[PDB]
Write an enzyme that holds these catalytic residues in place. Sequence first.
Site, PDB file in Angstrom:
ATOM      1  N   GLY A  68      52.876  48.052  43.680  1.00  0.00           N
ATOM      2  CA  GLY A  68      51.799  48.813  44.305  1.00  0.00           C
ATOM      3  C   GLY A  68      50.734  49.346  43.354  1.00  0.00           C
ATOM      4  O   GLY A  68      49.862  50.113  43.777  1.00  0.00           O
ATOM      5  N   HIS A  99      45.282  39.085  47.031  1.00  0.00           N
ATOM      6  CA  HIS A  99      46.645  38.876  47.527  1.00  0.00           C
ATOM      7  C   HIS A  99      47.139  39.964  48.510  1.00  0.00           C
ATOM      8  O   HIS A  99      48.268  39.884  48.991  1.00  0.00           O
ATOM      9  CB  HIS A  99      47.632  38.691  46.364  1.00  0.00           C
ATOM     10  N   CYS A 106      48.860  47.196  41.653  1.00  0.00           N
ATOM     11  CA  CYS A 106      47.816  46.181  41.710  1.00  0.00           C
ATOM     12  C   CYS A 106      46.489  46.782  42.160  1.00  0.00           C
ATOM     13  O   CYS A 106      46.456  47.678  43.002  1.00  0.00           O
ATOM     14  CB  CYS A 106      48.225  45.045  42.650  1.00  0.00           C
TER      15      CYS A 106
END
Lengths: 300, 301
Positions: free
Chosen positions: A146, A41, A148
């Site tokens: 952030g 993503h 991820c």
Amino acid sequence: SGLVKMSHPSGDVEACMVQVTCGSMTLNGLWLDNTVWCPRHVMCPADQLSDPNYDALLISMTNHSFSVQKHIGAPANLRVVGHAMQGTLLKLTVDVANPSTPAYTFTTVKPGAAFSVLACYNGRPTGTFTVVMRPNYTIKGSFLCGSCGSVGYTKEGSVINFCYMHQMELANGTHTGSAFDGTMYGAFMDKQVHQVQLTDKYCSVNVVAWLYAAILNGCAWFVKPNRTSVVSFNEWALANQFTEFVGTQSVDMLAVKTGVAIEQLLYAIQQLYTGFQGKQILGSTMLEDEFTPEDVNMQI
Amino acid sequence: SGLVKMSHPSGDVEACMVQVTCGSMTLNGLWLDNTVWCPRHVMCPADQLSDPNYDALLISMTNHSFSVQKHIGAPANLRVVGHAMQGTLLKLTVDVANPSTPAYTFTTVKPGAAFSVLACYNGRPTGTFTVVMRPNYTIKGSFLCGSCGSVGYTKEGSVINFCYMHQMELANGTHTGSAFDGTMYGAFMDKQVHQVQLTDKYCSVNVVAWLYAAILNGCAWFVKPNRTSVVSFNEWALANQFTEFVGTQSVDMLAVKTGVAIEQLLYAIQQLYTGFQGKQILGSTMLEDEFTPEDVNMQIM
């Protein structure tokens, strides 16, 4: 003695963290040999954060669209030289091989297994904690925007078993990622949308382990001759939100040392589920399922 | 969100762990620059745990009475060239400097503040976990025999703040150690004599923080209009094994984002000691005080 949750020392994993950045979108990357895994993503802008054709975003993208930077040290810049998709992850190939690549493997976990997490922001590790993989296939952690891409792992000898890369938040304080084969644990999609999660069963084996720990290190009281055959317990578990207790050598070891049979406990857990009283036992006030049998032996 | 227990990354500190040995006694030492710090009971044999006067034992030592091995990439063997004793710690000086010495300080932590422990065994890191310094000057951690020498630290920006060296278990499943000025945490002495207590108290400022995080995760009900001055509370705190809530830490800030007055919680905590309803607050029916204001900030800022 004393019973706390422990993550593994993160040194070896810390040396593999980097920040992947696709335009204005930026997150965390795992760098091993000369491959950098990261969540897919990152190549999704904002407007289409909804129903994105990833295969279109994949062919849309070119190697110049990416960037990756080692902040650890020495840095810094690596040239993205090839890209592919592997499930919910994105497999970037890079200019240089990580000179700090540990002996590593990629393995998936089952519900009730534990692993340690290295929580990073902009390719910079900030904290670590241990988590258990849940029955519904989520983890309870603390991650912020952030975070991820931040990874989960265990250590078998000198080999660092990589089992998790954080993807997204669902619910409140509840999280998921994928395994390094690309598969999201429990089917969830790498896009935030209505995808409400299954209910959470209590890890019965881990509780049993936890209760053995408590028999050691102190008390140890509810232990009575009243017992519940693992087979009648597993029937009860279906109705009351517990997992199907199996058990292992590691559990027998706990039985033998304490001298308390498995069942005498399986009974007890049925009584503390109702009696959320004691007052407490260790922690806790009632029922910890985060402590595995592997752990409980390891802390004797 | 969630609110889990976070130790700092161990990397920097793992680079500085070694093994120290004297006689056939063997524990974990910390190697920084040309200096290696380890607990002073290493040079005790075993028969002197009752009246080990270390004043005696330090003279009888030569440099060539201590072996010190690193063990972790890159290995290993380091050579002592200057011993000393400073409080309950041993200050060794060695032929080579640690090339992976981080930026660091020694700083004595206070009760209720938290820090990350790196558990070691034979100069080998093995687990990390965060813990809080209790009121009674103990830490309710998890160690075994051998881990003595293990170290506690708090990363402040780009600097490591060393605040612990593990020394003994008060035969309880709770533990104390030294700071890196020699001084023991609590006024304890490093010995096999049976030692006292100083009961625990709930860290007020930490419970308050936790309750805010509960509100931040949508858990409220314990909230009411009521209040109870800070000083009101502090007077009551004395009587019920709670710490003086100085709190007054630039947070607040949690009071600002929740719009729930610090005093309101002081009232709620008062009744929750009595209670609970019993509802549950972040999966608990007892007040949790191992989470600092800063934890709750970092974890949701």
